[PDB]
């Protein structure tokens, strides 16, 4: 499943991301756009043996367990396969842990590079929310 921008915005709102830790809905939508292109099934291998999973490209060294990543910590206490659902519940739950951990949304490379300091509200304009 590839979400539409506004579909995702609605789902992230339902799941409590609007203003979670001070970050407006558009930041979360923007992060997903540039991390995964709204693709719930996207995966990306890294040079350290970790893989990033799903809509918010959550990493298997720190956050979820895939069994094949060295130095894995499983800090969201979830299998990475749960982060590949068409249902974003698990990715949202883990995202809330990630953002609360000390970095805020700087945790997401694509957010800091493409979304931070931009008009993130553009990502929710035109949506029925």
């Amino acid at each position: 499943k590839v979400f539409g921008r506004c579909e995702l915005a609605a789902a992230m709102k339902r799941h409590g991301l609007d203003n979670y830790r001070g970050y407006s809905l558009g930041n979360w939508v923007c992060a997903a756009k540039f991390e995964s292109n709204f693709n719930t099934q996207a995966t990306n291998r890294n040079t350290d043996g970790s893989t990033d999973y799903g809509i918010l490209q959550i990493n298997s060294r720190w956050w979820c367990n895939d069994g094949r990543t060295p130095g894995s910590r499983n800090l969201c206490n979830i299998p990475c396969s749960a982060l590949l659902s068409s249902d974003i519940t698990a990715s949202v739950n883990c995202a809330k842990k990630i953002v609360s951990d000390g970095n805020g949304m700087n945790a997401w490379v694509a957010w800091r590079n493409r979304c931070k300091g931009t008009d993130v509200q553009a990502w929710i304009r035109g949506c029925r929310l």
Side-chain angles (χ1 to χ4, degrees):
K1 180 191 181 82
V2 186
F3 271 87
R5 181 175 55 87
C6 292
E7 189 189 9
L8 186 65
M12 290 177 153
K13 187 183 158 175
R14 179 201 157 189
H15 290 290
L17 289 181
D18 193 7
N19 208 36
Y20 189 88
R21 281 296 182 113
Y23 293 94
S24 64
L25 190 57
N27 283 288
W28 297 97
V29 177
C30 188
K33 166 65 181 184
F34 293 109
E35 290 287 351
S36 65
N37 210 19
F38 302 137
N39 196 323
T40 62
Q41 305 300 304
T43 69
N44 170 73
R45 283 228 37 77
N46 299 303
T47 60
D48 74 354
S50 77
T51 299
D52 303 308
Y53 292 88
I55 187 83
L56 284 167
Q57 293 287 283
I58 289 172
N59 192 256
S60 71
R61 184 179 163 180
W62 299 116
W63 307 112
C64 66
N65 178 48
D66 72 359
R68 55 176 272 176
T69 303
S72 58
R73 296 284 299 273
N74 199 9
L75 292 169
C76 288
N77 193 42
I78 198 72
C80 301
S81 66
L83 306 186
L84 296 174
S85 185
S86 54
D87 171 355
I88 72 172
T89 299
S91 293
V92 171
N93 285 335
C94 177
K96 289 177 177 175
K97 301 170 185 183
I98 294 169
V99 79
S100 297
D101 104 277
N103 36 227
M105 286 195 76
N106 283 324
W108 282 280
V109 183
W111 179 84
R112 48 180 197 265
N113 287 347
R114 298 296 306 269
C115 304
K116 189 166 171 177
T118 71
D119 178 29
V120 291
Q121 193 170 56
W123 289 95
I124 66 147
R125 274 183 220 120
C127 305
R128 171 50 195 162
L129 300 173

